[PDB]
Amino acid sequence: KSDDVNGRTKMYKNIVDGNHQMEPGMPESFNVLLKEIRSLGINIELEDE
């Protein structure tokens, strides 16, 4: 309902198909936070699947 550029679209396209099921992704605010931290002299990363 807030972030996840794909989450909003997928949920909306599902709600009309009679299927009430979310496909959670990654909150865009958090990717922006990763940018703002990594643009500094700080290196933040993610590891395994």
Binding site: G18, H20, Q21
Partner: protein, 79 residues
């Protein structure tokens, strides 16, 4: 208009596993993969799942058996 799920919890009293199991079953009835086990008195899949839980004819174990059956069912159609 399901108001209280007290008896529905009594079968699996964990208050959360109830939601997980009822969601699996509600999917089965909503995202077309199965049929209802209780006369659907216009009740939404959300409530019908809880009713199946109440009657004691649906839970984690029973659904785990049914899905396991359909696992081999999907392999008995490829010669």
């Amino acid at each position: 208009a399901r108001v209280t799920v007290q008896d529905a919890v009594e079968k699996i009293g964990n208050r959360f596993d109830l939601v997980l199991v009822a969601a699996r079953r509600a999917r089965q009835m909503q995202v077309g993969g199965k049929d209802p086990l209780v006369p659907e008195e216009n009740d939404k899949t959300t409530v019908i799942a809880l009713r199946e839980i109440e009657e004691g004819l649906i839970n984690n174990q029973i659904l785990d058996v049914r899905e396991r059956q359909e696992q081999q069912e999907q392999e008995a159609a490829e010669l």
